[PDB]
Structure formats: structure tokens, C-alpha cells
From a paper:
Specifically, CSF-1R adopts a DFG-out activation loop upon sulfatinib binding. Sulfatinib maps in the ATP-binding pocket of CSF-1R with the pyrimidine nitrogen and the adjacent phenylamine NH making a bidentate hydrogen bond with the hinge residue Cys666 and the N-(2-dimethylamino-ethyl)-ethanesulfonamide moiety extending toward the solvent-exposed area. Unexpectedly, the indole group of sulfatinib does not occupy the hydrophobic pocket but rotates out in response to the DFG-out flip. These results demonstrate that sulfatinib inhibits CSF-1R by locking the protein in an inactive state, classified as a type II inhibitor. The indole group of sulfatinib in CSF-1R is flipped out of the hydrophobic pocket via an oxy linker. In contrast, the solubilizing group is rotated by 180° in proximity to the hinge region of CSF-1R, compared with that of FGFR1. We supposed that sulfatinib may bind to CSF-1R as the mode with FGFR1, but the indole group of sulfatinib may clash with Lys616 and Phe797 of CSF-1R, which means it may have a higher-energy barrier to attain the FGFR1-sulfatinib binding mode. As to CSF-1R, the R-spine is broken and Phe797 is displaced by Trp550 from the juxtamembrane domain (JMD), thereby forcing the DFG-out flip and forming an inhibitory R-spine. The kinase activity inhibition assay results showed that sulfatinib preserved a remarkable inhibitory effect on CSF-1RT663I with IC50 value of 4 nM. It seems that there is a large space available to accommodate sulfatinib without steric clash with the isoleucine side chain, supporting the high sustainability of sulfatinib against CSF-1RT663I mutation as determined by biochemical assay.
Sulfatinib is a multi-target drug that selectively targets FGFR, collection stimulating factor 1 receptor (CSF-1R), and vascular endothelial growth factor receptor (VEGFR). To achieve this, we determined the crystal structures of sulfatinib in complex with FGFR1 and CSF-1R using X-ray crystallography. Sulfatinib exhibits dramatic conformational changes upon FGFR1 and CSF-1R except for the hinge-interacting pattern. Notably, the flexibility provided by the oxy linker of sulfatinib emerges as a critical factor for the FGFR and CSF-1R targeting, allowing sulfatinib to adapt and adopt multiple binding conformations in response to different kinase bindings.
Numbering used by the authors: 543 to 555, 561 to 686, 747 to 813, 815 to 914
Write the structure that this text describes.
Amino acid sequence: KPKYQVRWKIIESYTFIDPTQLPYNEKWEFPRNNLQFGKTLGAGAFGKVVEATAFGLGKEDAVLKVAVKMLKSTAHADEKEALMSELKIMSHLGQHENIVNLLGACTHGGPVLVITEYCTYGDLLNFLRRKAEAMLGPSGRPLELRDLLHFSSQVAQGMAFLASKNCIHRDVAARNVLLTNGHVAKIGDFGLARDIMNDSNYIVKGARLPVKWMAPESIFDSVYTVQSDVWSYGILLWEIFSLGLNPYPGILVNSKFYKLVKDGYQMAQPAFAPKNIYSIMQACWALEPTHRPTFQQITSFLQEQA
Ligand SMILES: Cc1cc2cc(Oc3ccnc(Nc4cccc(CS(=O)(=O)NCCN(C)C)c4)n3)ccc2[nH]1
């Protein structure tokens, strides 16, 4: 039996902020009657994300497509509190080009609605898989290596922003990266729109955990830091440069798997990774967390390669 819990954490000193104690800045408030909902984009056991037209949003009074996060009508008070905490974290962090940004919220007069940017091309994992199939078909445009480097660089920039705000993501993976206009990548947390209870990428342990993405110190000691996010980012790189294979393909998560990772087992070079991109992956998988690259080092390196 899983609970709906706040994914991201903010470091205080590791001491973490209690997000329930953060303030909600009413500058974000938007009238719920000024949303016209469209299709549901995804739904899980606790809520869903629905596209909508927002009328008069922002300083320019834009009329635009947005995405709206919401809980099920039957949500417990504990879950409504978690959605508010997620809202407060987004307001605390500020905006960046390579994250899925907060645009507004509806907190009065009904259930809490969190309004974010809408990303026209959906998640990166499905995008890469569908593009791979489109490219094999002949036997819109095809992917090239520079596209993969751009996606990778853009995610690293968004993560460098989060790290600069002392924010830990804890579920870095291609399924949590979206592509927007111009195929620009943005990192976010879309667990609410994901069917996690029936998702083979989350393993029951202790909690449903994305074990194949997790650093050994997270698996064994439940330690989460920016450096454990860097490990997960290395797994994301492997996803990108394999065009969306599952990590550790074909390997069952069991005691042997946990031991192998703790002892230094690493995936082999993906089919489309240049040697030095695989070397970055290996660097992200250093067993000593402080030996891993920073997101700024990753960003600068990948920007150069692109
Ligand atoms: C794996 C997954 C991540 C995820 C994130 C979600 O929250 C968000 C948040 C912001 N944006 C979007 N944009 C968005 C999400 C899913 C589908 C689409 C439309 S599409 O499939 O890429 N192209 C349209 C296809 N049809 C019209 C032909 C956009 N999802 C919503 C559902 C999600 N599913």
C-alpha cells in the first residue's frame, strides 16, 4: 500500500526543510474558472495531469495551453497537504529554462490545482523510442548525435539549477524529462501522472523505488544528495544514448543485483554513445559520491561536445 509523498527535498544545512512549513506566495493565485480543461495527459493512483486553456495568465494576459496537476476527488487530507508542499517547493525554487515551470495555482474555492508549463512533445523516453521506430521504418526529421547531446546538456543545466538551490530530485530518469517547443528538454517530477503501482521500473522494497536508477548509497542507506542525483543522471545518459533501452536490460532486481552494483558493476557502453560520453557515465557511477562530477561540470562538457 503506497502513499502519495513529496518527491523533491531541499537541504537546510544534511538537515532538510519541512515543506509544510514553507510559505505559499499568493502572487501565484489564478481563478479556477479561467481554466478550460482538455484531454487528460496522464493519471496515477492519487491524481492526474490534464491539459487546459488558461485565459489571462501572467503579466501579458496570455491565452495559452497549460498543464494542470490535481488529486482525485477522494484524496485524503494528507495527500492534499503533499500537493500543497510540492506547490510551495516549486514557488521556493524559482524559474529556469530547463525545468517545467510553475505558472499559477488555484488554492481557494475548491481543490488545489497546480498550473505548469505544457510541453508539446511529451516525455523524452517515449519520444526517443518512437523516433527510433520512425527511423527504422523506411527499411518528423531523424535524430542525429547532436540532438542527443543537446537533450543531455539541457537536462544537466536544469539539474545544475536545482542543485544551486540545494534541491534534490530523487527520481532523475528519462520518463521525468519533457520536450517542449524547439525540442528543448525540461526536467520535472510527473509521478502524479504516472501509473507507478503498475510500472515495472519501480520495485517494491521496504515503498516503490526506481532501483535501477538509484545510487548504491540510496539503495543501502537511504542517503539522497545532489551526488546521488548525479548517479541517476548517468543512468539517464545511458537511456538517451541507447535511444531508450531499459537500464541493466534483462537483469532481475534481487540480492545479487544489489551486490553487483555495490561492488562496482556498470552497464556497458550504449550503442550510440561516443567514447567520452560513456566516460562521463562511468564518472557519474563512481562509488565514492564526492568523486562524481558536478552538474555544472557535466553541463560545460556537454555544451562543448554539442
Ligand atoms: C511519461 C509521462 C510524463 C508525463 C508528464 C505529464 O505532465 C506534463 C506536464 C507538461 N506537459 C506535458 N506534456 C505532455 C505529456 C504527455 C503527452 C503530451 C502530448 S504528446 O504525446 O507528446 N503529443 C501529442 C500526441 N497527440 C496529440 C497526437 C504532452 N505533460 C503528463 C503525462 C506524462 N506521462
